[PDB]
Symmetry: C3
Subunit: 152 residues, 3 copies
């Protein structure tokens, strides 16, 4: 057949209400240290827009949710990233809490390639070191054979 395990998916998040099927239109998102209350600025962590060229621009919290339920900045849809896993709290436009998640971690595709590069390197180092160890061993075995023959 063929091995094909990458699924066509929608990576752009949408945020909807908790009790009705509606977007959190003009809602607010706060992002903080895991297992903390991110509405408290002391718990907040840096958030960045990732631009199309892959650069990052730090922005202020809260994140804003549009009528589609999507995060926007300056009238445009944006992808927001952090360095680490994080807590999140979502509020609706009336200031009522929609949701709270203590620990959220979704990696974008760059993390997968970084990890794959790291793994590749690691395995090469171990295998290279094993091969070098075997070469040291076979040289020793040869020295031993020579000694044995020397002494009868």
């Amino acid at each position: 057949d063929i091995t094909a395990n990458v699924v066509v998916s929608n990576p752009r998040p949408i945020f909807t209400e908790s009790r009705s099927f509606k977007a959190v239109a003009n809602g607010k998102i706060y992002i903080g240290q895991i297992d903390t209350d991110p509405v408290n600025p002391a718990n907040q962590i840096p958030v960045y827009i990732e631009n199309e060229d892959g650069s990052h621009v730090q922005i202020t919290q809260p994140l804003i949710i549009n009528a589609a339920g999507k995060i926007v900045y300056n009238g445009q849809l944006v992808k927001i990233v952090t360095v680490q896993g994080h807590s999140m709290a979502i509020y609706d436009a009336n200031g009522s809490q929609v949701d709270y998640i203590a620990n959220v971690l979704k990696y974008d595709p760059d993390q997968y390639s970084i990890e794959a590069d790291k793994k590749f390197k690691l395995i090469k180092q171990i295998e290279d070191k094993i091969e070098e160890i075997l070469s040291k061993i076979y040289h020793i075995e040869n020295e031993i054979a020579r000694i044995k023959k020397l002494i009868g």
Copy 2:
């Protein structure tokens, strides 16, 4: 620049109809062994609410979907977990099948840290063992040099 590969996302699932843009309001979800029919109780696997403190309480199937398309128990939104990947079947409030997926596996963030801890330990064990092997080898090399000198 900065490396930031954690994307702000919405980890709370929503369940919607297959032919119209609507929540599966008062729908039902069944969870079972991979590649099985989970409506059959003999194929069902334990499901648990994961509470805010991280504890688990086993609950009965089906899981219930509210007007927002979100899983609820006892009038509150809940996160449901299983130990293993699983099949899932979704029915609407009229008893009509909405969807069936044979094999679903989404890990929450705790799995990532468990795996990272396991990896860290593993690599340390291999590297420690390599270093110990090299130390054994260099001691042997030294014994061999001494022998060589002894016998001319």
Copy 3:
């Protein structure tokens, strides 16, 4: 307690408009090489329906989105896969661009088992090779002890 880190989730994607809370009804999706414009056929990559038995049938682009926001072929909901991470562009029924994502990578559960099998094998090979190296070393140590005793 119990370790349960598989979260009940909805793996079937839905595609919604960018400025209103609505499905991209009768929309179109194009899938291509990462960081390319997938509306250009020269940038497109093979897309396949993954059938219930796990087989694959290649289909033509664009992918079509129904009134629910879900991908359909021949009047039925389908799961679409590619071999590699990919770019994606979404258009609405009027030909207006809804979204563009340069690099999308979501693995279905089969990738996790392939990777787990590969990891298991790898670690077994390294550990087996370490054990064999130690056995070579202990045999050498024994030969050295014998030599030492022979020569005083």
